[PDB]
C-alpha cells in the first residue's frame, strides 16, 4: 500500500545520496556524512531533515520531514511530515531540526566524516519514518554500506536491539535526551 511504497522511496533516497569526492589535504564539507551543519545554517525547501515534533500531550518524537520554508523573524521552519498523511505540516524552532547529510562519506577516503563505534546517534528505525536513540555498532567499511546500530529498546533485558542496518542518510547527531 502507501506505506510500502514510501519505504521503497526512502530506501531509494538513501541509495542515490551522492558520495563526497574531496581532493588531497582537505576537510569534508558540512553535511558530508557525520560532519555537522555550518553554525548558522538554514536548510533549503525540499531538503530532508530530522524534525522534533511535540505532540499535543507533550510527547516528543524526532521524525523524517521535508523543509517547506524558514523565517529569520521567528527563527522557525515549516516542515512536512514525509508520510504526507492527513495534516503533514509543522511549524517549529530551528533547534528542533537537524538537516540530513547531503553526501555519503566514503569510508576509504573520509573516515573522519563517519560516526564511530559506540557513538550515541539518532537513527531512523527500519521500516519507520521516526528517529530514535542508538549506539553505533559499526561504521560502513565500503562506500555503499549502512551503519550497523544498536537501538535503545527496553523490550530486551539489556536494553538494546540486535545490530540493525541504517543508511548514512538516516543517521544524525543525537540531539535527544534519555
Amino acid at each position: 500500500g502507501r506505506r510500502g511504497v514510501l519505504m521503497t522511496l526512502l530506501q531509494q533516497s538513501a541509495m542515490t545520496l551522492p558520495l563526497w569526492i574531496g581532493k588531497p589535504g582537505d576537510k569534508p564539507p558540512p553535511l558530508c556524512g557525520a560532519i555537522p551543519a555550518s553554525g548558522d545554517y538554514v536548510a533549503r525547501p525540499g531538503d530532508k531533515v530530522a524534525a522534533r515534533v511535540k505532540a499535543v500531550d507533550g510527547d516528543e518524537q524526532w521524525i523524517l520531514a521535508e523543509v517547506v520554508s524558514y523565517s529569520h523573524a521567528t527563527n522557525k521552519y515549516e516542515v512536512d511530515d514525509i508520510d504526507e498523511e492527513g495534516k503533514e505540516r509543522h511549524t517549529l524552532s530551528r533547534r528542533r531540526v537537524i538537516p540530513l547529510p547531503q553526501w555519503k562519506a566514503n569510508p576509504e577516503t573520509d573516515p573522519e566524516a563517519l560516526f564511530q563505534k559506540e557513538q550515541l546517534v539518532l537513527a531512523l528505525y527500519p521500516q519507520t519514518t521516526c528517529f530514535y536513540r542508538a549506539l553505533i555498532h559499526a561504521p560502513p567499511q565500503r562506500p555503499q554500506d549502512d551503519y550497523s546500530v544498536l537501538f535503545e529498546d527496553t523490550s530486551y533485558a539489556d536494553g538494546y536491539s540486535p545490530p540493525l542496518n541504517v543508511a548514512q542518510r538516516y543517521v544524525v547527531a543525537c540531539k535527544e535526551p534519555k
Partner: peptide
Amino acid sequence: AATK
C-alpha cells in the same frame, strides 16, 4: 509519521 510511521512509528515503531
